[PDB]
Amino acid sequence: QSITAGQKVISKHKNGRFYQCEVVRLTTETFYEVNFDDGSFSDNLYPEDIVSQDCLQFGPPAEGEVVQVRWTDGQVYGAKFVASHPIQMYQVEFEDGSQLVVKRDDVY
Ligand SMILES: CN(C)C[C@H]1[C@H]2CC[C@](c3ccccc3)(C2)[C@H]1O
């Protein structure tokens, strides 16, 4: 079912619980897909996780470009850029004033 900006919905707060909130904007968020040097892949990188360049300012690396990626452990690993994945998402606001960007699957 279609979710629009201004709609009151239920979504996941930064504390991990579901609360009533308001959709404050529809937003396209870009995730990056890379191939690590061990042959493994990840398609959930933020553009800021590429530490060898400024992707927010200059855009994605070229397909096949060797990059340095800061992973979830704070460690930097070498990888090769594969693809950009722009996804329609929802920016929600809770009554404490906090805001998060959530996926369609986290909105009720
Ligand atoms: C998506 N993967 C399952 C996880 C990643 C990150 C944790 C190890 C890593 C990696 C990168 C480079 C060499 C060895 C190992 C980075 C890879 O396996």
The verdict on the CB of residue 77 being under 6 Å from ligand 1 is yes
Method: X-ray
Q: Kindly state the tokens that stand for 106.
A: 């986290």
Specify the DSSP class assigned to residue 7.
Answer: -
Task: Report resolution (Å) to 1 decimal.
Answer: 1.8
Amino acid occupying residue 72? T
Instruction: State the pairing for strand pair 18-36/41-45.
Output: antiparallel
Q: Which CATH architecture has domain 31-85?
A: Roll (3.10)
1-30+86-108 CATH pick, 3.40.50.300, 3.40.630.30, 2.30.30.140, 1.10.1200.10: 2.30.30.140
Atom from ligand 1 closest to the CA of residue 73? 7
35 lines ligand 1 (CB under 6 A): no
Determine the 3-state secondary structure of 11 from DSSP.
strand
Which two structure tokens, joined as six digits, stand for 50?
């590429």
